[PDB]
Design a protein around this nucleic acid. Structure first.
Length: 182
DNA sequence: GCTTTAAAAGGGCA
DNA sequence: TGCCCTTTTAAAGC
């Protein structure tokens, strides 16, 4: 972090394979923290308080865990959901846990000339303020999307490893500085 | 409460 | 096919 700023992780999306068929209607009735409407979505939605997360549990045994603040917390929450399911009578395992997306944010503490930035990086930028206030920066190396705001606040998403989040930010920092709004 | 970004999982449907 | 279905999260401006 040569910039001296470390992006704060805000959301983690992970998946794990409980590796066994699940009866969603049965889980929905037995569990307390569950909501299920197959007419609306194919998953049983369940939430736990710590780590604060929301899981999407499918009949196939696959599961998505969202909302955690770190990879470890995401794994811890997913394991907690796996236990809830096991305790409900299913032979759940914890197969192929994988971090699918990491979302982070930081503040460079200086305003940015978005249009000027967008113009000099047309091949990576999308800036249509009338639709969304942030400039969409699609970085190719690492393959990460940064939402750059006039305030100097930045959102960095698309990473499967936190080093990608940090690297994309370090890569953008000198560009942000070049376009500092005086 | 909406807009925008990323990602995963599945059923529905044109 | 292809893509929305839903869920999470930050941001600024409407």
């Amino acid at each position: 972090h040569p910039s001296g700023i470390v992006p704060t992780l805000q959301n983690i999306v992970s998946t794990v394979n409980l590796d066994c068929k699940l009866d969603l209607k049965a889980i929905a009735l037995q569990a307390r923290n569950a909501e299920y409407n197959p007419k609306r979505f194919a998953a049983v939605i369940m939430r736990i308080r710590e780590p604060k997360t929301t899981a999407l549990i499918f009949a196939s045994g696959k599961m998505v865990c969202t909302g955690a603040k770190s990879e470890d917390f995401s794994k811890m929450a997913a394991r907690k959901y796996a236990r809830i399911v096991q305790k409900l009578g299913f032979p759940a395992k914890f197969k192929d846990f994988k971090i699918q997306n990491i979302v982070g944010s930081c503040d460079v503490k200086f305003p940015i000339r978005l249009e000027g930035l967008a113009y000099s990086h047309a091949a990576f930028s999308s800036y249509e303020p009338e639709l969304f206030p942030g400039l969409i920066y699609r970085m190719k190396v690492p393959k990460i999307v940064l939402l750059i705001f006039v305030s100097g606040k930045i959102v960095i998403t698309g990473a499967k490893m936190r080093d990608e989040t940090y690297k994309a930010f370090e890569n953008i920092y000198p560009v942000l500085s070049e376009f500092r709004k005086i």
